[PDB]
Each structure stands twice: as C-alpha cells, then as structure tokens.
C-alpha cells in the first residue's frame, strides 16, 4: 500500500474457452488475448487451478503451470493448454455438478489477475442421469464451462524496476 506502483504493464483482454464442453478427461483449452505497454523483464507465469466441494480433498488443486518466454510490447495472444485433474484426487461419491476454476496470470512471483468460472458436469447417458452410481465413472462427465459469466480479479504489484535498494 505505502508502495502503489499501481502503473499495470499487462492487462487481460479477453479468454476464448475453445475446446468447451469438452469431456472431464480433456485438456483445458483457452484463449487468452493481453496486451503489454512496456517491455519486461521476466517472464508471465499462467496457471489454473480447480476448486470444489468436498469432504477432504478436492479444492485448491492446482491443474497446471507455465511460464512465457519474452513479452512482446502490444497486443499479444497465447493459447493456453491445462492437464485436467487426476480422477485420484475428486469426490469418490461425487456427484459435485457445479464445481470452480481460477485461471491467474503472476509475475516475479507476484499474482496481478484472477479469472474466476463456475463449471457445469453431468454423466453423458440418459439413465446414468435418473440413476447415478456410487462410483465416480469419470469418463462418463461432460464438463461445461459457464464462459459466459467471468469474474475478474486485478490487484496491484510491482513490477521491474522501483530500484531495489535506495
């Protein structure tokens, strides 16, 4: 706070969700548009991360992390690609239909934006969707990104120079 250095480099622009409604078992697929006012030293770091109900663990479970090389000043585009989540680590008894996902960029280290996006499974047969198992068939959920109803989330941190030690 008694340091603002507010001035944003990056700034999100917009997140194609192509490949959306994949099956829970595909990759994430997005379309990220950003621009850069000034050049950068370091590198973006994207990452997403699933978050759900529970009854010990299945939030927080980061799906994946990348780092981008140089930021060319502008109007960029990077596709982002995000393993999906390992079926070891969801509800065994689920049937969690509404779970979220945290797309957020970082930079040295330091968060500056967060994509929130509630997401929408069902098993994929007609009966199976009148009459559940007691077994999460993983390979039977079709996953449904609301990417329609995105929360945006900007907070402020330093970027390159402020001249470390004055």
Not at 82 to 101: C, F, G, K, R
């Amino acid at each position: 706070a008694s340091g603002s250095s507010g001035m944003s480099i990056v700034s999100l622009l917009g997140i194609k969700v192509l490949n959306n409604p994949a099956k829970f078992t595909d990759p994430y697929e997005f379309e990220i548009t950003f621009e850069c006012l000034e050049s950068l030293k370091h590198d973006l770091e994207w990452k997403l991360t699933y978050v759900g109900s529970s009854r010990s663990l299945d939030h927080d479970q980061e799906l994946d992390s990348i780092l981008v090389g140089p930021v060319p000043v502008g109007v960029n585009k990077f596709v982002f690609s995000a393993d999906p989540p390992s079926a070891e680590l969801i509800p065994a008894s689920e049937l969690v239909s509404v779970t979220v996902i945290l797309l957020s960029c970082s930079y040295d280290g330091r968060e500056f934006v967060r994509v929130g996006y509630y997401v929408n499974n069902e098993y994929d047969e007609e009966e199976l969707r009148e009459n559940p198992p007691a077994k999460v068939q993983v390979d039977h959920i079709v996953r449904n990104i609301l990417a329609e109803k995105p929360r945006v989330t900007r907070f402020n941190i330093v970027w390159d120079n402020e001249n470390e030690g004055d």
